[PDB]
Swiss-Prot record:
Family: Belongs to the type II topoisomerase family.
Effect of D29 to C/H: Alters metal-dependency of ATP-independent DNA relaxation, prefers Mn(2+) and Co(2+) over wild-type Mg(2+)
Recorded consequence of changing D25 to A/N: Strongly reduced DNA supercoiling and relaxation activity. Reduces ATP hydrolysis in response to DNA binding, but has only minor effect on the basal rate of ATP hydrolysis
Effect of D27A: Strongly reduced DNA supercoiling and relaxation activity. Reduces ATP hydrolysis in response to DNA binding, but has only minor effect on the basal rate of ATP hydrolysis
Boundaries of the shown chain within the full protein: 474 to 540 of 804
Positions contributing to Mg(2+) 2 binding: D25, D27
Note: When the enzyme transiently cleaves DNA a phosphotyrosine bond is formed between GyrA and DNA in an ATP-independent manner. In the presence of quinolones this intermediate can be trapped and is used as an indicator of drug toxicity.
Binding site for Mg(2+) 1: D25
Protein purpose: DNA gyrase negatively supercoils closed circular double-stranded DNA in an ATP-dependent manner to maintain chromosomes in an underwound state. This makes better substrates for topoisomerase 4 (ParC and ParE) which is the main enzyme that unlinks newly replicated chromosomes in E.coli. Gyrase catalyzes the interconversion of other topological isomers of double-stranded DNA rings, including catenanes. Relaxes negatively supercoiled DNA in an ATP-independent manner.
Subunit structure, interactors included: Heterotetramer, composed of two GyrA and two GyrB chains. In the heterotetramer, GyrA contains the active site tyrosine that forms a transient covalent intermediate with the DNA, while GyrB binds cofactors and catalyzes ATP hydrolysis.
Organism: Escherichia coli (strain K12)
Effect after changing D27 to C/H: Alters metal-dependency of ATP-independent DNA relaxation, prefers Mn(2+) and Co(2+) over wild-type Mg(2+)
Signal sequence bounds: none
Designated name of the protein: DNA gyrase subunit B
DNA sequence: ACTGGAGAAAGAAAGTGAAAGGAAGATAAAACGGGATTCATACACCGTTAAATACCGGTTTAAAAATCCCGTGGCGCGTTTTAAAAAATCTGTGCGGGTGATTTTAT
């Protein structure tokens, strides 16, 4: 991410990407990992969430064929 | 001539691999101290007796005990410090289903 941490050198103006996308698996463990990542992002880097640099992807789970 | 982009030089600040050495550990050789045997030899217990000591009666006298006056330092009180012990609060960890990953050899 290249922003630092610890609020002593944590500068939110050095973010190397203006769009961060979370893309895990489509089952429940993906949901658990998503919750863990959201907890980390909210507790450690509030400004990134406030400015709107976090997104969520939605991959499919099933594929159906008939002919 | 002038402008602005771009590539190359040059210079300074940060990360790096290697460094005696020394306190901090670690590991062996040595000196020590505490049990099992083995007796010869000195020690414990029993009769006999001369002698050394305990005891009583009455002095005494010099020394120690008893008594009075006083002037202090050594205990007692109140109030603070300061370690020491106790109660309270954090830190790891393993049990069993789940998610995802690493390494060395032969031909």
């Amino acid at each position: 991410l290249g922003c630092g941490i610890g609020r002593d050198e944590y500068n939110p103006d050095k973010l190397r990407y203006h769009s961060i996308i979370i893309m895990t698996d489509a089952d429940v463990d993906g949901s658990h990992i998503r919750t863990l990542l959201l907890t980390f992002f909210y507790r450690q880097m509030p400004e990134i969430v406030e400015r709107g640099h976090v997104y969520i992807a939605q991959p499919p789970l099933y594929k159906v064929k008939k002919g």
